[PDB]
């Protein structure tokens, strides 16, 4: 979306994580690395 | 930039027929000469 | 390919075009971006 | 903290703080939208959002600019004038097709006050399609020139415009659109107050008198988050008091289901009590519930709740419910569409199409049991995501968007006082008990005794409670009131009647010295009788042309004059229709189509061929403008009349209602000879019928006293 580093914590995150578009907030793990042509894959094991 | 006509005040031509004017006329006006006379008000088709 | 004609007899003209987004199409204009450039065409001409 | 307002006020306008000073709402004069922005975030930064565009174009300054009404940018078989940029408020134009075609719709229309066009949507249409054509709304674009069956047309609106409605649409089997008809809307459109609640009640009223026999269920969902506020609760509150008593002025007393969510989702009345019926036992529930807890717990999780609605109607392996096929669900929420916890809502409302077997035929689409209202509270709603819960049924709307609240509770003390025209006729609703006169209430089946003559058997249609309609070439002047029995509903005994009234233009032998002996003209008559008939579940009456229940019937405005209603029934093109024939002591239904358009006079010269008409020689001497014709071989084989089946009703099926628009009258060829149907019909082997809309100045009359409410 954006290079930001404005940072600003809860008052530039919360409201852009609390918009009606945003559907999910994961946190997660990669594991591996998959280029294979057309897309790349990234597989991400969600931690919580 | 800040002249010329702004893009999203054009409004753009559209109505590109092949064929049109389909109509019937009845020459219903008073008759000179054995002549009837009848002014129609049409509108241009946007094709150059 | 769109042509742009100047049909004036001694006037140079200073345009600039520019080409909409469409979600069907997948060109270089965005929805946060816009595709034109500004170029000059010499009476009784066209260009490209 | 609070944001700073300096740098955001709008040029022509001033402002109001909602929910705290966290936002500001624009508000403009009468004639005037915001640009872009309707409203604005206040952002923890200091500063509030920036004007972006749809677009996102940074502008400077905001100012109010005034109201235009959609471009048509796109009409196909006709031409439109003027053409223009832009149309300001009160511009009109005008609609008009080319040779061959017929203008259905609005052919003026008017740009007024909320952005919308007048009217209906003209429709430039050549009836050569078994779907009608379903026209271009002004805004909209449509793909899909071909209007065959099982074809599909896609829709889209112009830039920075909503799509209202059904994206997609499929002519289905029966000449009918799946879907309801688009209309683009902006972000400034809203709805009037006196137009929610005239749509809302012509749709709930559908779904409540098929319902008639306790099996209806209604579920009321409420939105709690804390976008909306405290002061907006307790006026939506009030306005959920008002709706309860309107559904039990029907005499239908359904069951009730209570939830109001935010973060979670709180059942506070379910439908499986025992209580849940009672409708005045709910009431005294919403006086009880309090918002206390919802505040503590500020969201929007739109799925959740849904998910409670789920598992309201859901069984746990009940195995199939009595209900399951016969039972009628409607669904009313309000919320501001800006959804933020749970994920798509859309995915519920899949797995309750599915629980309740909708779309898994194709027989057999079930779109009936299964209404879903949304209504928008605020200026800040999403009305994508407001459309896509809605559902979509033909010529109805389910998509509200109002401001303020309190207009909203002006909506449902209006619709209080408006009176819907219940119409019991043309109701079948699918009991399993499927033997005739089930599917046929109507029709009534005349005998008449001759010295000698031997039986006459006719038929007619059940119009009212003393009135049977039929032909009046039946009877005769000597025929005596003694000698005329009438059974209806499949009864073994005969009612008896008062008085058969003939219309007054009815001269059978008239002709006789032009050497035609017989002559067919307004072949029309009524049969009053002595008893009034008791309503149920095998006598019904079928509706009429030019009624007050025939306008509610078709979703019609109630300003459609009788003539907009010609236009409706009757167009200029070959119309599916159907009658009621006796195949072998059992009643079955045959599928014809009335040639209205450039066949009607393929159809007509064939009476040529009639007896006793072989030497006729004006054409149009026997064929008065009173007539319609059915039967022939384009474009498709349609089954004859017979002699037994003369006087019975034509009948037109429109939206899973039955409306007469005809009575049987003569036939060219007798294909029936009582022994079976001649399986070799000859082209030519065409049917007349006595056309309705000409026999209305009488039909008024002799019925004035019935409760059918003629339009004027
Ligand atoms: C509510 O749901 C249930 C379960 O789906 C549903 O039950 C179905 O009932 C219909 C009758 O109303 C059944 O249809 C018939 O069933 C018999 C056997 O019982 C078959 O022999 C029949 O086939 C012949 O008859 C037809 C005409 O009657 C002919 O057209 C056909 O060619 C055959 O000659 C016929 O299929 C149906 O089988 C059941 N289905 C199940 C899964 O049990 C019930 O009707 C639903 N209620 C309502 C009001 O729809
Ligand atoms: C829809 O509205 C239009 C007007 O907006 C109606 O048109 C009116 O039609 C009548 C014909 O009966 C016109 O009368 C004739 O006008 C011509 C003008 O050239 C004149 O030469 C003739 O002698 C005759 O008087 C009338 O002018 C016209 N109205 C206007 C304002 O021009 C139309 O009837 C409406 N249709 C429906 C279905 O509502
Ligand atoms: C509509 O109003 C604008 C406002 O100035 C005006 O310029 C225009 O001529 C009017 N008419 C049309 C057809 O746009």
């Known amino acids: 979306i954006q290079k930001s580093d404005d940072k600003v914590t809860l008052e530039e995150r919360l409201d852009k994580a609390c918009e009606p578009g945003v559907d999910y907030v994961y946190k997660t793990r990669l594991v591996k690395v998959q280029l294979s042509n057309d897309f790349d894959e990234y597989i991400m094991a969600i931690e919580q | ?48 | 390919r769109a042509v742009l004609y100047n049909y004036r007899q001694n006037q140079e003209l200073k345009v600039r075009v520019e080409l909409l987004h469409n979600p069907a199409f997948c060109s270089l204009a965005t929805t946060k971006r816009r595709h034109q450039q500004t170029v000059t065409i010499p009476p009784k001409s066209s260009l490209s | 903290g609070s944001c700073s307002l300096e740098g955001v006020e709008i040029k022509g306008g001033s402002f109001r703080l909602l929910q705290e000073g966290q936002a500001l709402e624009y508000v403009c004069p009468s004639g005037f939208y915001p640009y872009p922005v309707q409203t604005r975030t206040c952002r923890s930064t200091g500063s509030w959002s920036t004007l972006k565009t749809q677009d996102q174009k940074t502008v400077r300054k905001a100012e109010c600019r005034a109201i235009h009404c959609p471009r048509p940018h796109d009409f196909e078989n006709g031409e439109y004038w003027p053409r223009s940029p832009y149309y300001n408020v009160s511009d009109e134009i005008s609609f008009h097709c080319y040779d061959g075609y017929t203008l259905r719709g609005s052919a003026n229309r008017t740009c007024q006050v909320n952005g919308r066009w007048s009217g209906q949507t003209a429709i430039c249409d050549n009836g050569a399609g078994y779907c009608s054509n379903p026209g271009i709304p002004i805004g909209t674009r449509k793909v899909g020139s071909q209007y065959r069956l099982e074809d599909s047309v896609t829709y889209h609106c112009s830039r920075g415009l909503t799509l209202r409605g059904s994206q997609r649409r499929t002519c289905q089997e029966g000449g009918s659109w799946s879907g309801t008809e688009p209309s683009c809307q902006d972000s400034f459109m809203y709805d009037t107050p006196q137009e929610v609640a005239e749509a809302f009640l012509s749709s709930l009223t559908e779904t409540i008198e098929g319902v008639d026999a306790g099996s209806m269920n209604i579920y009321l969902v409420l939105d709690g988050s804390g976008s909306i506020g405290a002061s907006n609760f307790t006026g939506a509150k009030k306005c959920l008091v008002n709706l309860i008593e309107k559904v039990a002025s029907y005499g239908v007393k359904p069951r009730y289901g209570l939830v109001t969510y935010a973060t979670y989702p709180k059942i506070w009345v379910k439908v499986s009590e025992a209580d849940s019926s009672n409708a005045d036992w709910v009431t005294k529930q919403l006086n009880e519930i309090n918002y206390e807890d919802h505040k503590l717990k500020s969201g929007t999780n739109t799925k959740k709740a849904l998910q409670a609605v789920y598992s309201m109607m859901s069984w746990p392996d009940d195995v199939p419910p009595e209900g399951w096929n016969r039972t009628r669900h409607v669904i009313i929420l309000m919320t501001d569409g800006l959804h933020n916890m749970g994920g798509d809502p859309i995915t519920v409302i899949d797995e309750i199409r599915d629980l309740l077997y909708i779309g898994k035929d194709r027989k057999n689409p079930r779109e009936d049991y299964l209404d879903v209202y949304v209504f928008g509270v605020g200026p800040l709603v999403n009305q994508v995501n407001i459309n896509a819960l809605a559902s979509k049924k033909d010529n109805e709307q389910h998509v509200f968007k109002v401001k303020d609240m309190e207009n909203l509770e002006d909506v449902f003390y209006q619709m209080i006082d408006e009176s819907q025209s219940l119409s019991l006729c043309g109701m079948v609703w699918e009991h399993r008990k499927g033997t005739d006169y089930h599917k046929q209430p109507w029709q009534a089946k005349i005998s008449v005794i001759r010295p000698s003559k031997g039986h006459e058997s006719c038929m007619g249609a059940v119009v009212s409670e003393y009135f049977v309609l039929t032909a009046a070439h039946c009877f005769t002047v000597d025929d005596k009131e003694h000698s005329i029995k009438v059974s209806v509903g499949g009864e073994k005994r005969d009612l008896e009647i008062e008085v058969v009234l003939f219309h007054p233009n009815y001269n059978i032998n008239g002709k006789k010295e032009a050497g035609i002996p017989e002559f067919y003209d307004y072949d029309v008559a009524l049969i009053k009788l002595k008893n009034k008939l008791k309503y149920g579940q095998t006598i019904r009456p079928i509706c009429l042309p030019c009624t007050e229940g025939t306008t509610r019937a078709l979703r019609l405005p109630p300003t459609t004059t009788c003539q907009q209603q010609k236009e409706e029934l009757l167009p200029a093109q070959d119309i599916k229709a159907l009658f009621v024939s006796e195949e072998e002591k059992k009643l079955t239904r045959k599928e014809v189509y009335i040639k209205n358009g450039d066949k009607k006079g393929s159809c007509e010269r064939d009476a040529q061929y009639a007896p006793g008409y072989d030497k006729v020689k004006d054409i149009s001497e026997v064929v008065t403008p009173r007539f319609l014709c059915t039967g022939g071989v384009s474009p498709y084989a349609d089954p004859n009349t017979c002699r037994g089946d003369s006087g019975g009703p034509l009948i037109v099926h429109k939206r899973s209602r039955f409306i007469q628009v005809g009575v049987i009258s003569w036939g060219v060829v007798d294909v029936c000879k009582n022994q079976k149907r001649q399986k070799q019909v000859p082209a030519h082997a065409r049917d007349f019928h006595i056309n309705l809309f000409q026999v209305l100045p009488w039909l008024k009359e002799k019925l004035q006293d019935e409760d059918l409410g003629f339009l004027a």
């Open chain 2, 1 to 48: 930039d800040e002249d010329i006509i702004a893009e999203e005040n054009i409004v753009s031509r559209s109505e590109f027929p092949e064929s049109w004017l389909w109509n019937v006329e009845d020459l219903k006006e008073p008759p000179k000469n054995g002549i009837s006379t009848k002014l129609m008000n049409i509108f241009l088709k946007d094709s150059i």
